[PDB]
Amino acid sequence: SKIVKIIGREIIDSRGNPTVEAEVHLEGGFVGMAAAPSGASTGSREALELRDGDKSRFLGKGVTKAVAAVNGPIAQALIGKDAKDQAGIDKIMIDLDGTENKSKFGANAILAVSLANAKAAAAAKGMPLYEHIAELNGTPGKYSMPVPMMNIINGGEHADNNVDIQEFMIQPVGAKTVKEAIRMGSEVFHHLAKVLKAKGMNTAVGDEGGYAPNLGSNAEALAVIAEAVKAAGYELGKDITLAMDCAASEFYKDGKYVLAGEGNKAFTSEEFTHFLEELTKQYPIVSIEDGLDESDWDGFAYQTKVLGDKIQLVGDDLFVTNTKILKEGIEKGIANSILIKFNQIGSLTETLAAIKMAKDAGYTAVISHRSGETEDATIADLAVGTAAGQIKTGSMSRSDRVAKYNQLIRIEEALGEKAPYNGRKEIKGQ
Amino acid sequence: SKIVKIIGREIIDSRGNPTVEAEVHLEGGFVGMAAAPSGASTGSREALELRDGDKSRFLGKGVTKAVAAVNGPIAQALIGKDAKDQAGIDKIMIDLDGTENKSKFGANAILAVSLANAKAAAAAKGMPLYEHIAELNGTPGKYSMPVPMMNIINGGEHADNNVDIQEFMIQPVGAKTVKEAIRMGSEVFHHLAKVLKAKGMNTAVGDEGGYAPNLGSNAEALAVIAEAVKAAGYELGKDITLAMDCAASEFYKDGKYVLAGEGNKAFTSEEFTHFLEELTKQYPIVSIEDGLDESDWDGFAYQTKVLGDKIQLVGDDLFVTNTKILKEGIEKGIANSILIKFNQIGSLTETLAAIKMAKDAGYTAVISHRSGETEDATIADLAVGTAAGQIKTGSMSRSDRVAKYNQLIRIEEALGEKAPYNGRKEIKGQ
């Protein structure tokens, strides 16, 4: 299925910042279109998106250079190639860029094309993207509907409140289908608004579409969530479990973890691990993301020994979707789960490798959104087509989040029994 | 191009509430897909969406009945019919519903199918929807890129502050393309966050992606915008003009207008308009929507007299996309503009009729989003394909808004100067 044209353009993301969109056209009029979510333009451990740094446009956040790479050197290299050969296409782009972190063309240029290409090839094969992804994965016809962890309450660097935890999420594990799980999320989301309004708190939303009300403590965040779940007619534990993202590095200093939402109590890493343990004993918290500083590998080894058999321990900042870091972590018994952010690696082929590494080690792969998203719903097809089993794609508001939920509804309608919603057992430790 | 299959489903909107999506499939395999944005399920003057009222699902806001209407009676009445005959398709559905306000099947059921059908027909003709809409309109090849009024600050019932006016919007009139207009909107939006942060105010967003900070007064609202516009390096009046929506029914008390945010001075129809007048001389506010209660026609006649030659006077609640009110309003000399919400009427054919009625009277037609949107960007194709000249589709955040800006970018890329961006002159009285 020969590529005949590739078009790149500067579009706008859910936070109002530019990002790259690509269209890939094939002989016969097949077309695929995808956009990159927002990422890092600096750092030493992840693939880098390319930004223009022109202060006279979009406050320096233009992506005209990345778009030019798509329209010029990338398009010229890929014209005439077989879009079905996903690994081949990704390899051409990675070699042409020539850097180890895609910083010449941008991870945003390369990813937009990688995804657009996969969609085009799927269309050339008369199949949806999730089905094509399963074939590319070597697992044809193997699907699952992912168990969503849905943002509900924001704290830390994502709020102006006295909650240390960066986010609390619900997981509708008692649902029989993802369609049901989405309805359960929606209902709790709306009841939470009611709870917060009765308290005179703000229900305007953050980047992920959840709330960041002026809560006075970590305990108060858990309490309002509990009240919302109850108000919606559900049971904590049985119907809905909790996941959290500590972003613990945000409150790490001088080798201690210091929590303002605990009245500025200080914890060593072993002590914080035991703080987390007690939380999991009092609330049905079954997943904990970045529960220690990324540099704290001795700490993470301990945390994994203490909690790992019963709790999902998710690396985000810890692994940054880097298989080199993940391999070492597996060797050292660090965590048991990884957040997959495809724009941190920058190609579909490499993304499939990362999920595979995780699964081969018995770690779970959690497909993730970014703070800057678009109406693109590629991560939905990715989660289904790899049977990843979990997804982290936002609260039940903002179409940058809800477009992914809608796509899971569509896919589940198409597949029915061919794509089971496995519920809590998808979660590491359950 | 005969209809072979039509698939209705319940998906989720940008606020987390159910709505209806429809796919229309044709002989040859052509497909179109669209979704209804959120409307009213009660009301006397507009088409009604059908909600289930089952309190055990989505707090009573299920759309399973409207979805069943799409899959059963609507689909069965349309199988074998010519999708190209938009008027004929729309007529079949309206006649079968058999009510005046589409309350049997729901405006949500009929509109989703109307729009999906138009999209499938465009595909069967090998053209984008905007091109097909121009053809349906009897105005082939006539386009423009709409001048957007972008939500930026919210007050009244749309916030918890001391601003009485429901929303302030910016219009990038000095741009030469819609792509440039979008970039200007984005820049001001980011500069506004900086300004609010600098005052220790909240930058979380509302339903339409704008801010609803704790401003003490209407004048404080206008001042922070002016400040953001200057910070962004534009000049108020030349580069960017202001639009507002008073939602004046909200402070209408026993025949008078009470604005708490301002001494509670309780104005008469007459004094409220001179009050607005005073704002328009102090700020380049060039458009005022619902500047008086929608029953206060004798008051609107006065406003249209005083401001009508200088200022765009937009009817939203005033007209609710209802040609009977519009017709009556034109003859009486009420307002000079109209917000077009295709779900308030319920079919694309009726929408085209409303736009044409306005146009024919020299009224401006402003194509509008709803509070509850989806990733669907039909209104972008609508605004262009009718050369309406103006769009109201949100702030520069949330993909439920920014998908529409993205689609406008794509369309302008394809059309170039065939779809001119006319700037300030689109606005009535400018």
């Binding site: 269209e23 009029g29 077309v31 269309a123 050339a124 993207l129 719903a377 | 465009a122 595909a123």
Partner: peptide, 28 residues
């Protein structure tokens, strides 16, 4: 041949984004 060729993705963002799919065999 694609049953439903697009000149540009803007001609059907839904089909170009993979949110809706052509149904095979194609009814003719």
């Amino acid at each position: 041949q694609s049953p439903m060729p697009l000149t540009v993705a803007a001609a059907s963002p839904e089909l170009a984004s993979g949110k809706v799919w052509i149904r095979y065999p194609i009814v003719r």
